[PDB]
């Protein structure tokens, strides 16, 4: 359902996948101890992801296979999108400079949304414990 707030706790893979995007120290570590909270809120074809993060409490949202294009903080252009496969999210987001991609698999169990992350080879898996 996701409808509802997320507060990530442990993550699983996370440390590693900065430093395929090119993230050093200070930058994957802030990233990590982030404090992620993400307020999900659902209205009907759009998902605003409230951000709480330690970059800036910003709303994403992505209407479900949009096309669009996000600024990270040290991660720059990502564009891509998001699709419901049925049973999974999956966070596909390419790149403007070159035009490879990354994924990201929303993993719901239940009481837990896990992101993976992949931008290749090196997942990132940040479970949520939702609440
Ligand atoms: C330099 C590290 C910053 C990147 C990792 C922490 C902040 C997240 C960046 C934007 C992600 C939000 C847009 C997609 C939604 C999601 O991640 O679930």
Same mark, same amino acid.
């Given at each position: *359902?996701?409808?509802?707030?997320?507060?990530?706790?442990?993550?699983?893979?996370?440390?590693?996948? #900065?430093?395929?995007? !090119?993230?050093?120290?200070?930058?994957?570590?802030?990233? *990590?101890?982030? %404090?992620?909270?993400?307020?999900?809120?659902?209205?009907?074809?759009?998902?605003?992801?409230?951000? $709480? $993060?330690?970059?800036? %409490?910003?709303? /994403?949202?992505?209407?479900? !296979? /949009?096309?669009?294009?996000? $600024?990270?903080?040290?991660?720059?252009?990502?564009?891509?999108?998001?699709? #419901?496969?049925?049973?999974?999210?999956?966070?596909?987001?390419?790149?403007?400079?070159? !035009?490879?991609?990354?994924? *990201?698999?929303?993993?719901?169990?239940?009481?837990?949304?896990?992101?993976?992350?992949?931008?290749?080879?090196?997942?990132?898996?940040?479970?949520?414990?939702?609440?």
């Amino acid at each position: *359902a996701f409808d509802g707030t997320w507060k990530v706790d442990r993550n699983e893979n996370y440390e590693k996948f #900065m430093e395929k995007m !090119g993230i050093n120290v200070v930058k994957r570590k802030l990233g *990590a101890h982030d %404090n992620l909270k993400l307020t999900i809120t659902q209205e009907g074809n759009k998902f605003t992801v409230k951000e $709480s $993060s330690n970059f800036r %409490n910003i709303d /994403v949202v992505f209407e479900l !296979g /949009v096309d669009f294009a996000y $600024s990270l903080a040290d991660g720059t252009e990502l564009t891509g999108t998001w699709t #419901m496969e049925g049973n999974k999210l999956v966070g596909k987001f390419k790149r403007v400079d070159n !035009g490879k991609e990354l994924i *990201a698999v929303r993993e719901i169990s239940g009481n837990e949304l896990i992101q993976t992350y992949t931008y290749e080879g090196v997942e990132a898996k940040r479970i949520f414990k939702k609440e």
